[PDB]
Structure 1
Amino acid sequence: SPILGYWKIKGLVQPTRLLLEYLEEKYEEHLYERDEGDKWRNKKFELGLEFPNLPYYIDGDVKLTQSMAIIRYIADKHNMLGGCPKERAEISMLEGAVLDIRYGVSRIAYSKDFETLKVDFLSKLPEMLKMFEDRLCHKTYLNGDHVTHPDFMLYDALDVVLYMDPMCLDAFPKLVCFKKRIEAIPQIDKYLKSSKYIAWPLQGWQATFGGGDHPPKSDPQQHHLGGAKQAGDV
């Protein structure tokens, strides 16, 4: 059975976990705890990875690193990347646009002066969310009536920014509905309430925002889940 290795946090791999659950695909996870950085380093170069890094995905005759290569690989095995160059480009564009939001958070989540850097991030966020809001006019998912991996990437991004600003989706009803729609998918609903769900942290434990072993205050605001704030996976 395939192995997905990463820190026991949402971070870069959460969208991949969501896609795997969405596809109801069987996989095992090697979860590195907060103080297991030493364990990681001792195995980093003994796994047969050509470009050692976290996350990594190992299955039948396939050893991969790079979060985006991994999530795209899983989608590709289920014929979800796109039927022609144009559609594949549309999917990669959506992908990159979600990354601008998600990485936008991580870019300043570890800074000592997060409280001041966010005011700017949150001022540029509406413009970014608006494009997804418009994309969803008459569309159930990004790309139409069918689910694609960027939907899970966007979901992850929405989950994270909601913590930073619980009201950032007030002017975007379609995005609110989108979030609920993903959570309403049977396999996802079950997963979010399961013991394998990792609700926190959002970033690496050391982060000023979305860090720590448990959700602090002035951030933990995002309804509809199952809990598991105390990690819970191993």
Structure 2
Amino acid sequence: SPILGYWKIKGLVQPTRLLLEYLEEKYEEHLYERDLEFPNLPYYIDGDVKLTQSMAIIRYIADKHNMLGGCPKERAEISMLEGAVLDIRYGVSRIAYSKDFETLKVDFLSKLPEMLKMFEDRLCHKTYLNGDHVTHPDFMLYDALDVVLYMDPMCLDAFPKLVCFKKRIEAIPQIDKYLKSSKYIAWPLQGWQATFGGGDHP
């Protein structure tokens, strides 16, 4: 059975866990708690491959299920959505370990509406980000939305399509079951030492 190793946090691997549950893949986790030889996190091991880099890991899983895109144009479209979600999610992580977080968050939250609106407009004519069918950037976006809502519970008040998308992802039977399961890591969002999304509880 494939092994996914990471900290016992949401962090970089949360969209990968959602994708795996969506696909009903069987996998074990190595969960590293607060306290090959270090090692390098996250990693993903099945028979064939040994991977590091969270984006290589999620892309591989998507790739094994033919979800990366059927032609160069489609695959670039998916890569583009990926990069656009990462600007949000990395935007959070970039400031979440600062003593100055309270200041830096002002800048971040000022730029967030424009970042969100691309996804909003995209969602006005598509059910999921790439259309009728779920793709891996959908779970990346879900994770980014979950994280920013802890930063600003109001940040989606002006985005009803994104509000709807978040509920839609939550209603996928595999996902709804996973979020209610004992497998679900609710918190922390970042490493425990973080000023935002760290600590033991919300």
* TM-score normalised to structure 2 length: 0.97
For 1:145 and 1:60, the matched residues in 2 are separated by: 32
Query: SS at 1:151's partner residue?
Result: helix
Measured against aligned partners, the alpha-carbon deviations of 1:67-88 in whole angstroms (never above 9, x if no partner) come to 0000000000000000000000
Structure 1 stretches of at least 4 aligned residues deviating more than 2 Å after TM superposition:
49-52
Gaps of 5+ in 1: 35-48, 215-234
Quickly say closer, same or farther: Cα 1:192–1:71, change in 2 above 3 A.
same
For 1:61 and 1:82, the matched residues in 2 are separated by: 23
Residue 17 of structure 1 and its aligned partner are, at CA, apart by 0.2
For 1:81 and 1:169, the matched residues in 2 are separated by: 28
For 2:153 and 2:184, the matched residues in 1 are separated by: 21
Query: SS at 1:119's partner residue?
Result: helix
Residue 52 of structure 1 and its aligned partner are, at CA, apart by 5.9
For 1:60 and 1:186, the matched residues in 2 are separated by: 29
Quickly say closer, same or farther: Cα 1:73–1:164, change in 2 above 3 A.
same
Residue 7 of structure 1 and its aligned partner are, at CA, apart by 0.2
Quickly say closer, same or farther: Cα 1:50–1:95, change in 2 above 3 A.
farther
The answer to whether the 8 A contact 1:94-1:150 is kept is yes
For 2:116 and 2:38, the matched residues in 1 are separated by: 33
The reply on whether 1:104 has 2:88 as its aligned counterpart is no
The answer to whether the 8 A contact 1:52-1:65 is kept is no
Measured against aligned partners, the alpha-carbon deviations of 1:10-63 in whole angstroms (never above 9, x if no partner) come to 0000000000000010000000001xxxxxxxxxxxxxx799620000001110
Q: How many residues align?
A: 200
Quickly say closer, same or farther: Cα 1:50–1:66, change in 2 above 3 A.
farther
Quickly say closer, same or farther: Cα 1:15–1:90, change in 2 above 3 A.
same
Quickly say closer, same or farther: Cα 1:195–1:95, change in 2 above 3 A.
same
For 2:97 and 2:88, the matched residues in 1 are separated by: 16
Query: SS at 1:57's partner residue?
Result: strand
The answer to whether the 8 A contact 1:15-1:152 is kept is yes
For 2:113 and 2:38, the matched residues in 1 are separated by: 36
For 1:55 and 1:138, the matched residues in 2 are separated by: 35
Gaps of 5+ in 2: none
Quickly say closer, same or farther: Cα 1:58–1:109, change in 2 above 3 A.
same
Measured against aligned partners, the alpha-carbon deviations of 1:145-190 in whole angstroms (never above 9, x if no partner) come to 0100000000000000000000000000000000000000000000
For 1:81 and 1:51, the matched residues in 2 are separated by: 31
The answer to whether the 8 A contact 1:57-1:65 is kept is yes
Quickly say closer, same or farther: Cα 1:50–1:174, change in 2 above 3 A.
farther
1:6 equivalent in structure 2:
6
For 1:184 and 1:210, the matched residues in 2 are separated by: 25
Query: Going by fraction, where is helix more abundant, 1 or 2?
Result: 2
Q: Percent identity?
A: 100
Query: SS at 1:192's partner residue?
Result: helix
Quickly say closer, same or farther: Cα 1:13–1:132, change in 2 above 3 A.
same
For 2:11 and 2:75, the matched residues in 1 are separated by: 25
Q: Which has the higher contact order (CA 8 A, sep 6+)?
A: 2
Query: SS at 1:180's partner residue?
Result: helix
Quickly say closer, same or farther: Cα 1:76–1:159, change in 2 above 3 A.
same
Residue 116 of structure 1 and its aligned partner are, at CA, apart by 1.0
Quickly say closer, same or farther: Cα 1:124–1:62, change in 2 above 3 A.
same
